[PDB]
Each structure stands twice: as C-alpha cells, then as structure tokens.
User: Fold Histone-lysine N-methyltransferase SETDB1 from Homo sapiens.
Amino acid sequence: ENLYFQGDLIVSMRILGKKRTKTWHKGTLIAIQTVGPGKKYKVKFDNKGKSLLSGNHIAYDYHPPADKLYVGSRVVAKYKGNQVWLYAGIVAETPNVKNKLRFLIFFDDGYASYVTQSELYPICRPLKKTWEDIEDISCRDFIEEYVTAYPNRPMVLLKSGQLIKTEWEGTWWKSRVEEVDGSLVRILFLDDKRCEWIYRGSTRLEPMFS
Ligand SMILES: Cc1nnc2n1-c1ccccc1COC2
Assistant:
C-alpha cells in the first residue's frame, strides 16, 4: 500500500537519507510504501536523485532531545581531514561531568569522536538491536558487547608520554600517548608521525588486548 502517514512521518517532510556512498544527505520524503509487514521510504535528495530506503536509513532533520538519547541509540553525526560529512553511528556516552557534557559517538567505520547535541540527528526507525545494521561483523560485535555490557566498561588508564603498542592494519606499532580527552586517547604512531583518536577500551590498544 501507498501511505501518507506512518508513525510520526508524513509525506512531503524534509528528512535525511543514507546515500550509497554511506554519507547522509538532505531530501524530501516523497512516498511511503508497505509490502506486508515491511515498510520503505522514498526520498528525493536535493540533487533530484531518488532512493527507496528502509526506515533505519532515514533520519529526522532535527537534533534529538537529550531525554531521547541512550547508550546504544542509532544516530547520524557530524564526522571529520578538512571536510565534514554526516555519518551513522551509535551513542556510546551521554553528557556527564567526566566527558564535559558531550556525546561519545562510535561511527560505523570504527572512528570515535565526542560531539555536541547540535551535531546529531536521530535515525527514524532504528532496529530493535540497533547495532544489527552495522556492516562490518567485527565492528557490529564490538558494539553489541559494549552496549549490552554498559555501564561495565573496561578501559586502560593512560597518561601523556606513555609508550604503548597500538594496532593498525593488523599489526602492532610503536606509539605514544599524546593526550587524553574523557574516554578517548590521542595516539601518535612513532614511525609515521601522525595521530589518531582511539577509545580507551579498544583492543587496538595493546594493554586492552592483554
Ligand atoms: C573496534 C573498536 N574498538 N573501540 C571501538 N571500536 C569500534 C567498534 C565499532 C564502531 C566504532 C568503534 C570505534 O570506537 C570504539
């Protein structure tokens, strides 16, 4: 059937849709379709191109209220070289004193960042197990364990200057802790002389792996 209304969604509304590139873009909801128990949402992107999307691949074009964001909530967030995209992830932390009132996001590709409320958008129809549409099995299983074990979160305590081994492309590299920010650590890879922010509970940090 063709619907005009479905839950709080209405045909003609502005919305965000996931493109094939895996980045999210503004568009208009032009149709809602049912096929038995299933629902699909037709989006016309601002470039005139159209996709027929599952409800976990559209997001509201507003910032979620804080009382609607939980650990494990499925969101689209602002993602950082010198460019900014909108990319899907999972809420890992909500605002508290220790994180300076920010949200910790674990993005689907394995990146992590702190963001503000104004950098988040809620996915319209998240899966019951919100991690189940994370493409990479290793990423997906990590999130399942993290979200379900929460608030039990083993983490390594690290200090600036500390020498550790950090994983990259499947092997261990000599690295140094450059700075710490809440549950994230900035690691300098010593051979390459570039940095990455990594979650302190990541098994990419050799002390966590052990
Ligand atoms: C693996 C892994 N180790 N620490 C993290 N992850 C992860 C899994 C899935 C999505 C995002 C991340 C990155 O931040 C959290």
